[PDB]
Structure formats: C-alpha cells, structure tokens
Design a protein around this ligand. Sequence first.
Ligand SMILES: [Zn+2]
Ligand SMILES: [Zn+2]
Ligand SMILES: [Zn+2]
Lengths: 112, 87, 178, 171, 107, 97, 270, 551
Amino acid sequence: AGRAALYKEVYNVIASDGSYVNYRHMALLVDVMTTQGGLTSVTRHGFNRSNTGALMRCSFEETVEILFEAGASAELDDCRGVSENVILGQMAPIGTGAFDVMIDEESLVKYM
Amino acid sequence: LKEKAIPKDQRATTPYMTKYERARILGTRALQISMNAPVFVDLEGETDPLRIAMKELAEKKIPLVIRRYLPDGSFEDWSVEELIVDL
Amino acid sequence: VSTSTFQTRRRRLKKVEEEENAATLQLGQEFQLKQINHQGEEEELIALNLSEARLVIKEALVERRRAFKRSQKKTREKELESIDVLLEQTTGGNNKDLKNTMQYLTNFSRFRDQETVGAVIQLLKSTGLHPFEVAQLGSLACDTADEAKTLIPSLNNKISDDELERILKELSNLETLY
Amino acid sequence: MFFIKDLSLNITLHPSFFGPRMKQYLKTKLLEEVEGSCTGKFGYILCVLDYDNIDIQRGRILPTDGSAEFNVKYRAVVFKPFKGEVVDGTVVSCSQHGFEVQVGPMKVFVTKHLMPQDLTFNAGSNPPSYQSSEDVITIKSRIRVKIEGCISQVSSIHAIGSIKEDYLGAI
Amino acid sequence: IFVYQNNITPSAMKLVPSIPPATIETFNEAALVVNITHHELVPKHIRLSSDEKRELLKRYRLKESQLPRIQRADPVALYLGLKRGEVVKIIRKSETSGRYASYRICM
Amino acid sequence: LRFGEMERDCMIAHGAASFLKERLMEASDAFRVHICGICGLMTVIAKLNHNQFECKGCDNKIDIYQIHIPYAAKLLFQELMAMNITPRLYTDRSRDF
Amino acid sequence: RLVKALEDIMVHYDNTTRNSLGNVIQFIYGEDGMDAAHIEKQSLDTIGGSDAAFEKRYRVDLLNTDHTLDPSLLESGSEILGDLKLQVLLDEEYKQLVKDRKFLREVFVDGEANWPLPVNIRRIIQNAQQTFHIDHTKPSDLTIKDIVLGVKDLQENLLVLRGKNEIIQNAQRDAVTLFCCLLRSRLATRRVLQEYRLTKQAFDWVLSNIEAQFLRSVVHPGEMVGVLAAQSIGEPATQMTLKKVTSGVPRLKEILNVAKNMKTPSLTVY
Amino acid sequence: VGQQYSSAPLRTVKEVQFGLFSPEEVRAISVAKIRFPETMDETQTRAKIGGLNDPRLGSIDRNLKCQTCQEGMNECPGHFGHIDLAKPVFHVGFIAKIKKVCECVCMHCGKLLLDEHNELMRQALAIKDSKKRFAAIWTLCKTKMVCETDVPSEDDPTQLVSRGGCGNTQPTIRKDGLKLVGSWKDEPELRVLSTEEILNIFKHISVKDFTSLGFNEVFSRPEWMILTCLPVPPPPVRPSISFNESQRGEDDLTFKLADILKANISLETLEHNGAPHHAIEEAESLLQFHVATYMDNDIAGQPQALQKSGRPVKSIRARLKGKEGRIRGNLMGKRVDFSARTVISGDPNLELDQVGVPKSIAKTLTYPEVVTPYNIDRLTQLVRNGPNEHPGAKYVIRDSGDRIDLRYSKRAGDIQLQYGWKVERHIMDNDPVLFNRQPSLHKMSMMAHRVKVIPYSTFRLNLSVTSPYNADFDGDEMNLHVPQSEETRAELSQLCAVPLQIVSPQSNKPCMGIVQDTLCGIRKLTLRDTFIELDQVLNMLYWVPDWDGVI
Ligand SMILES: [Zn+2]
Ligand SMILES: [Zn+2]
Ligand SMILES: [Zn+2]
C-alpha cells in the first residue's frame, strides 16, 4: 500500500508540471525503493547502505569512507555493475555486453 | 561449473534476435571482415565490411554463436542461423 | 598462452604449502593420486616405465603421421634409424628434448613388445602399489628385495620382502632379448 | 616415472585464420607452444597424444579486436624428475669437478664428492675418465643415479645426483 | 492470539516466545477496530507452502536474498501471521497488464 | 573534450557498451599493468625485453597476468595502497551468485 | 541522484528486471514485459456505455429471427439459423466479453477506456480495408467457427514468456490479460462482420499482423531499463517551469529524501 | 595497452578483494629502504639519492631506471617503498573503528567483552552481514565495562561457570582528536591509551572474535588498523618535475612524507639517547599528526598542515573525493581524444539523420582504417593526397605498431601499402559520429548522426532535430565524438542513430516534429484558401527527392 501511495504521489508531481511519463519508469523507481522491506531513501544514507559492490557505492557522495569500510570489512566486489566495469575500463554487462560471442568450428566448414 | 550449459532442448530465451545482439554480431563480424577474415557470402561487389556482414546475416552464412547469460550463472547457446531476424 | 591444467586451489593470499618433493611418494600438486580426467571425473595417476612410455610415444607419432596423410588430399639398431625418420617428419626440430628422450627410451627399453609390456602391467597392477612405484619397479632391473627396497625407498614394508622377490624373479623371466 | 597428464592451453586466433581448416592451425599452434617446452610446475612436456581427438571447443571472440580466445584441451606424455628418484642414464661430459649423466631430456650432474672413495679422476687418458680397482666411468658409460636436488630453469630442468649409496653407480 | 485492551506489562511479555513450538501473537484492541486488508490500495497477499516456495525459487533460479522483501512487523505480515522466511504471492492490479504477480519474503 | 558522467549515463541507457569501453579506455586514458596471481597488486617487475618477471614477497615468476585498465585506475589503486588499503584485482571469480 | 540509484538495473534473458547483486525488482518489466516505444494509447470498447448498447454491439443470437445475422453480412447466415453447436461458441464469446466488462470496471475505478497498449488494432482494420478492398455490400465468406476459433488460437500464440513450467505459464497468462481483453473487444462476431466486414483472407492476415506486431513489442534483454527510467523522470523534472499543498521540485525532493518531517502533511477522509 | 608486447596472458578483472596491508607484507613488497628525508641532489648532483625518490622506486628524468625493469617513464608504473615508524600510529579513517573495537574487547587479555552465554548476544551473532553484525555487537557490549570470568549457567543462575578469564574493569573510552582516553572507578582514573597498548590488545583478539566483529583473519586483521610500516608511494603518485636543470618542482605528498621522516628521526633519536619518557611523546604526537595529515588534511580536530605559502596541503583523501576529483573527475568522467566542439547552426536542406561538420574539423579528426583488399586502392590514394588535400590521411600505422607521420615523411609520394596496416584517414563523408549536447539529461541528448563535410566554421544540424537536443542556435556549442572501431561505429548505427530515436520511450510518443519556420509554413500551406499554379507546382514536385516522376 506504501508502493501504491508512493507512485500516486510521484505521478501527481509529474502531472503538477502537467507532463506525461509511462507507468513503467515510475513503477520501476517505486518498486526499487520498496523491495528492501520498507521505504528506502534516495541519498548517501539511502542506497549507499546497500549490499552492492563497494566500487559502485563509492561513485556517489561517501567515497574515501566507503573505500575505508571496504578495506575494513575485507569487502568483495563482484564486478557485475556498470560503475565497477567503467572504473576498470572494460565492456560492461549492459546492453551490447550482456551476451557473449563464439565461433563454431562446424558451421565454419559448412559455409564455403 | 560448465554444468550451467543449458541443453539445446528447453529454451526460455526468445527465438528472435535483440537489437543489442544484431548490432554486436554485425559489429564483430564487420571488424573480423576488416581484419581480413574469410567472406562466406558471395561479395556482390562489396567494399564496406558492415554491408558484407549485413548480407552475411541475410544469407545466414555467419558462423557465430551467441552465449546468452541467465542471471543465476546459467547460459543458452544460440546460433545466428538459429535466431529469427524479423526486426 | 603457455600451458594450463585443470585443478586450481583457493588463493587465500598465503603461499606456505609447496613442500619438498621426496622419494617417499611426495609428488607435486598435480602429480598426486586423485588426478581429474578432462571430462570431469576421478582417475588414478598415470605412471609409465622405460618401455611403455616409448610405446605410447611411438603409437601417437604413427597416429599423427597417419592423421596428416588423410588431410594431405584436400631389432634394437634398426629401431634407432626408424625413430630418426619418424621424428624428422612429426616434429619441427624444436623438440630436441623429445628426440633425446626417444633415443634414451629406445636405449634403456626394458620390454620392446606391447604384449610383454601388457603382461608386465598385469603382474604389477596386481600389487595395489602406487603408479610411480609400479612404473619405477618396471623401469629398474633389480634382482634382490634389499636392492629394490633401497633403489625404490617408498616400498619398505608396503609389500612383503618374499612376495616382492616373487614379482622381481617374474620380471627377470619377462625380460626382452636384443 | 613418466606421467600422462590432461592439460589445457589458451590459444588466440586472428580473424584472418577463420577459414574452414582452422582446426589444423589451432592443433599446430598448440604443438608449437607446448611440444618440447619445459616448465617448473609440470616438467618437460614431451609428446601430445591423439592428434585427432584434441578438444577444439567454441572460441570466445573479444570485444576490443575480432580475435578469438580458444581453450584447447589435450593430453601429453610429461617428464618431471624428483629428489630420491632412482634413474639410469648415460655420461655426456666429464671434469675434475665431476661427470654429467644424461637421463631422458635432462642432464643430472654427479659431483666428485657424490662418488665413493676409490673413484678417482684422471684426464691423462683421452677422454678424461674416472678410475677404481673395478669401476671406470668414461664418455658414454651407463650409470644408475639417485637424484638429490632439482633446479627449475628456462625450457630446462637440471639435477644433482649421488652414487655413493648402495646399488648405484656404473651398471 | 492475545487481544489487549490498552497495554501488557513488560514483566508479562517475557512469557510470549517462551513456550515452543507454539507461537503467541499480540494485537491491540484499538488497532483491530478497522481492518487493514479491506482498504483500497492494499493488494492481496497470499501465504505460501514450503513446496510453493521451493518451486518459486527453482523456476526463477534465485537465492532467498535475491527476493523482494516484506518487513516482519508489516500490518499485512502480522495480519497473515507470517513467520521469518515465509513467502507471499502479491497479486495486484496493473494499468498496463490488469494483473501482476509479485512475490515478497519475510524479514 | 570531457565525456562527463552525463555522457556516461546516456551511453549506458542507449546500450552501446563497446563504444563506452572505447571512449573510457582506447581513445581517452588506456593502460596495461602486470599484476600478480597471488596478491592483486601491481608488484610484478616486468623486464619484458628478456621476459623476466617476479613478484617479490611472493616468489612468483610463474603466475602473472597483464591487464588493461585506465591509468587513473592504476592511480586510484596506488593511492588506496598509499593509505594501507589492499585493492586486490583477481582475474577469476569464486562468489558465482 | 536518480541515475545513480538505478545504474545496474536492466532487463535480463528471462524478462526479469534485476540489479548488480541479482536481487529481483520487477518480475516482467512494466508489469507487462513490453518496450515503452512500441506502446500506443488505445480504447477498450468493453468498458463504457450501457449494458444494452454493449449487447447491441457484441451479442450474437443465431436462434432468434429478431437477432440473427442477416445473410448479406455472413455467407453462412441463412444456414446459421438455429445451429446450437455454433450458438454454444457465441455464448462462450459473449460470456468472455461480459467477464471482461466486469474485470475492466474492477481495474479502473473511473472506468477509463483509453490506456497504453501494444498493437494498434484501429490501424490494422483500416489497413486491411485498404489492402483487400473491402466492400460493405457483398457478404463475408467466413464461418462463425473461423472467427471465434481464430481469436481463441491467436491468444495462445501471443507470447511474452516461453518457459515450460506452471509459474511461467501463469505469469504469461497474467501479463497478457489486458491486451487479450482489448483483442476480444475488437474481435467480436458482430464487429468482424458488420463494422469491419472482413473477408477470410483479410481476417487471417489481420491475425498474423497482430501476432507479429505483438511479438516485436516485447522488451529486449539488455535494455538499460534502470538508467532509461531515471532519465525519463529526470528530463521533465528539469523542464519544470513552475487547495494549497507543496508540488513540483519541493514535493519531489521531499519524496526522494523520504521526509519524515513533511512540509505539507495532508489527509483526506471519504 | 601501455605500448610494447609482453607474453604474459591477458585477462579481465572479475573480482576486487579489499582488505588491509600487513606491515610484514608492506615490508616484503617494498623495493626501497627509505632513510633520507631529502630528495635528489647527492652533493647537489642532479640525481636522486638512495633514500627518498628512486632509491629503487622510479625515475624523475628522461632516463631509464626502475629496478631491473626500467622501460622508461611510459609503459612502466611506479614501485612502492616502506617507512619503519619508531612507535606505531593510528590511521585517520580507522580511528573510530579502533575505538569501537576497544570498547568491544577487554584490555590486557584480548577477549570479547561479551560471550555466547548472553541471549541478546546469540540474537546478534545470528547476523552474518559484517556491517550489521558489528553494529549490533558494539551497541550491545558498550554497556558492559567489566570482563566477566563468572557467568550464570544455562541451567540455574545459582551455578556460575568460568566463561573466560580476568574479572578486570574496562575504561570508559572517549576520543580527543588523535588520541583516546579512558576511566576506571572516589575519583575516575582518567588515562591516555597508547598506540602500542591498543595494538597488543588487538593482536591478542581470537579469530572467532576477529570475524564475529566484521573483519577477516586473511585480508583485514584488526591489528593492521594501527600502522607500524608506512607504504611509500612511488613518483607517478607524487610527481617531481625537474624543469630543464636549474629547477626542482616537488609535490605535496613528497613534502608531507619528508615531514614524517623528520618527525620519525626526531622520535628515534629520543628513544635511543636521552629518554625523559614523557618528553619523547611530543615527537610521537607530532608523528601522529604528520602521518594522519599525509592521508587526510580536512580533519575535524582543527590544525591543517599548511604549506610555506598558506596552502593547507593536497592530502590523499581530498585527491579521491569526487565532483572533478579522482573517482568522479578521472574515472566516472574523463577528457577524450577524437572529439570536437563548435557553434551550431540550423539547416533545412540537410537530412534529419545528418550532421554538418566543418572541413577544418574533418581534416583534424581521424578514423584509423584497415588495409584490406576491398579498399586498398582508396587508402593508397588517401596516402598520396596527404594531410592537406581534403580527401586524405594524417598517419600510417604499420602491423609492427610503428607510426609514420605522413607530413614529415619525405617519400609519402611513393609509400607502398600491405594488408592489415592502419591508414589514419581524415573524417570522410557519411562516417557515423556521436553528436551530443551538454548537459546529457536523457538518451536523446546523445544521438548518432551521419557526416556531411561543409565549409564555414559551424556545426549544421537539422532544424527538427533541435527538439531532443534542447538548445537553440543562439550560439550553442556541441560535442562530436569519432568512433574508432568498425564495431563501435556499428553500435552507433544500429543503436544510437537519429531515426531510431524518433519515437521516445520516455512517454511512448515521438520527440521530433516539424518546427518554427517549417511549422508556420505548413499550416499556411494547408488550406482551401491556399492555391498554387502549374509553374510553382512543377518546382514543388522537383523539390521532393523521392518523387515518382508522375505529375
Ligand atoms: Zn604477489
Ligand atoms: Zn620500474
Ligand atoms: Zn578480560
């Protein structure tokens, strides 16, 4: 009922300007904020309190500090996030980089 | 684990090729065509590797296999020939 | 881009584990009994004697010499000279090590027949002794139980002295005449 | 002693080699990079067995360049010597310091001090030999040696062996 | 279930989880007066069996942490008498699908 | 020219992963280091003229990997190292999840 | 802020919207598994008007001289008179449409016909009338069986989720619900042979085009749904050039920061 | 790549393991000893002394050296050193975690102040999340200030069992900038807690407790939060720029490090020589400052390490902090090569999917192409035309990675090509590009266009395409990025392209329409009052590029 009330207000703010946004985007942010069991804030004390990779979390507000908690809690970085692949200068698993590509020895001889 | 290789039977992934997929297959295939890779489709007077790759995907003569990764760790291996390029 | 295996241990930062390799079956990390086959299953360690090894190599060189002919379309002294020829075709000079190993294995060959080598392996695998012990007892030509338990110091009392003597005396009958 | 181990190798192919008989060049590059090569961890990698039944696998293409990373899985006859290992070999070189006995692809050095009392050096007989009231070690004699220590090098592995303990020396 | 008019002493409440395997639930008389689930924007939360939970995680291929969560003291969580680890198939209304089946696990 | 956080955001939204890899590495920064297989630190004294390596404090002249990371990353890591924090980089995972 | 909070969030190879950890956010993106751009605003004819106007537009009765389809509309119209086997399917169609009416009036409080859904049904009809040169003079060859069973079969082919098991089949069923209600509202036996006057060829083509246009509309695994959603919220909040309660930028930051101390606390009792 | 080949296998970072540096590990990794608090100029000779900067670490000049690797400045990263502190010191960031752990464990014995025997402790130990587990444990045993030896059994409390040892009283620890003070109880024993004391108590903590306190016996040991051995950063982190000869040009950190060595030497001196005990702790409290101020200067405990100018010194903590910092200044957002920025002008004769790029930006921005049979003739001609004839090339990169600068090349009018090389050629017509406008608030603000090389200095975009870019032609500037790879440009074509962005997924509707001039024009044109004769009609037909040829 909280998820519901939150969308109702967000939508009332988009309509306060008098503009239109497709349900999905809002329902997405809204469900992101609720999944955690309650109403989770959108600030340094909100998302930067999550289980997510230390390198991702350090890219917003609490840098040196979260890195000190990484070195203190011997934190492990899964390298499955955007920010963490961006810092490492690699092909992030987003869009184009979600799947993988391989050649088939069989098909290579079939076509010729 | 390599057990995570989902059989060629049972595939929850869509039979169609995604925009991200066709763009990477074509990109990589054109990049190889420029590294002077062999061209399977007969070049109807084609100079541009992108166009060569486009005809290669049209004649389904590309030898590429897309390894789609399922969130848990799992994967479903699909061919360029296997996928539908309706789009 | 060099040479990889199959078994990898957890990088728990610390290194202190690589112990001295001794006579008393203290083989390398890869070389222990529980080796894992490429398909993903348990396998007893592989250890050849100075004859069986030569046979395996000679088999695989003949099979490469033949494997190339398909894709080409679209006693004692005589052996040295035959091996010279096959090696000069199957290898690209670089294998100077393999060529030397081929000459050494053909020289110090205990049994020059896959038949006799087979009967030897039947007599040896029946011990229940470790592959390296089986291979070494199959490459070293001993006559005594004391000589054997000294040149191979892993034996000691894993086998009875008299029983080992019976195996030893059988090997001497199985011996190859040049 | 000679082991037979199941090994893998990461070979990288350039798109120019993406033509029907690719398998040929993959198998060939594997045999260039591995055959004859010595490593500390595995020893002298002598001969890859079964040319045909070598795992080709699906080669993962990179997102930088069109090159393909292949993990070719094979099996080979390997030679790794150890301390305590008793192996026979044939002399190669000799000096006042000692003689060098050749075992398989390697050279195991036997120091003067690693030989018994009676064994005495004499260069005043060509080629320089070793004398005793029964034993004479020269140029290419057969000796049973007990390896005491190993040195892991480039594409080489050497050892130091003794013959002073019982049932060893010339055969 | 225990219905308290105004309050229970902390000397008493010590006896609440003291007796196993049984569970003692505590709800205020005033808080009961109006039903929560009966409200407009409260969707239908449905308790799941061990087999239902195992199949949910088996089919979608997830870890328990990988699931959206519901607080232990949530109005609907107490109403349903949900225990730490139980799942609820929240079937709600969608302005683009009509129905959407969501899932929530206890905290 | 600055390809700012804004530009980063847009490219991710678009889904052009290979372009963003190029623009972050290839075009802009670009760097190759020799990290140890034991401790994920740029320790390995790579004498690549005569292929000598070695990670002192590891006795590792065997297990070394070359990695492509921005110089600002090599920098970030060396600045975290400078404050007594170990940012170990491992080429192969264990977590799975 | 929004951008950062939704970075790692994208649609996977199973249609689930997940993050860097792998924790699920939305089971099938947007509750329907459709790509935003392919969706258009359409009308659900099964919602409004009187139950009498509803009956006038959907109800088909082969057994009643004062309700039967005139054979000038249906070729099998003179021989349809009385066939209960076919009538049983008309009673199935009409029971489904009435179940639809009551379901839609349950989803939308106000009962709004206009909602964003894939496949522009409106267009295909017109497009068929352009391609097949449909003339509202000559009778439609189609069998009352061909229509009802054609729609019933089309529903079975409108996929979003492929998975073999029950949970997946039930999820697919749930997500497609609203679109199938719109499909049924526009593909009734009255409308098909009176308002549209489709031929067999035209009808079978229309079905194929709805199927293809729907199958195309499904979200693409890899779609950066998170960052896209963040920027879709960001841009109109920036272009915000602005009975008394805080709205706009203040109420927006108030919500994003989850103010326990809110500027304008309002309560409304019915 | 950092230029030059190494046989070492190339792999991707799939895991990032954080933790702490063990003083023994810092010492092991250390390539240099670090003894001199000076820099270069050994007897004033322009050469680094074997003490601070290049006692092995790395070169400061255009001259090889880097312990056996060398390779010059480029290709070779810096190598770390070590500092042996006479007395251990606290770490700035770890100060509070040190305090918290001190309040969690009994001093002298090193055992947890709380044991399993407590019901609320059992409830706490259930949490396996390091952060939440420790947050619970501290809040729980900050109240307990006596290490209980005797604890009432899970049977009846009449039978107390010895859970551990020492019934010793714990002090009420409170902060004081750089040091901690505690008190035991008429009158409380207010005493100073020393780095050494705290270290030994930490060293004494059992592994069970270690991990159950939000740590790790392998990667992050509580003990290592107090620094014994300082890791010396190499010259690339602290650049020393010797401007030709007569200049030095050091760095902030280099000064703070030299100040630490000064503080350390002054401490060591008083330890060995005349030790007035509570007169030595003066150079220790200064070392405590210097070391902690080397990492963080923007501290709460007022004194900032100001330079001999008034600059409070550029501390490591400040370097990393974003919004044009290190993370958000060099890794999240960075400066790029193959980019252009000029004024934008509107055009009705171009296409929607195009961008007008000036000839001067065309002859500057360059795509590296592959020498392929399919275009070998074209590339040979570009190489003939050179860098100034519009259709030409700037450089020729060989397979060997060697680059020929076509302009300084005297025989660049005979040069032969061979397959697989790279011809860095000028931006040719119809080459895809990323034309974008700052600030990039939504997907649409970053679109992929087609190239149309035009004269006159401005970027000519299509009138209708200003709508998703959100900026007029009132002197607006726009970025333009050159994709370097065939796959990279393929991405721009099959993902970012202008026709694909027409229908906006932000609001399921189009974002581009007909605007301004074209808009008022089309309305006035669409009427029963609007009439046009044969002559103007023939031309209006001819102005349609895709006209059927039927009047
Ligand atoms: Zn190391
Ligand atoms: Zn160096
Ligand atoms: Zn104590």
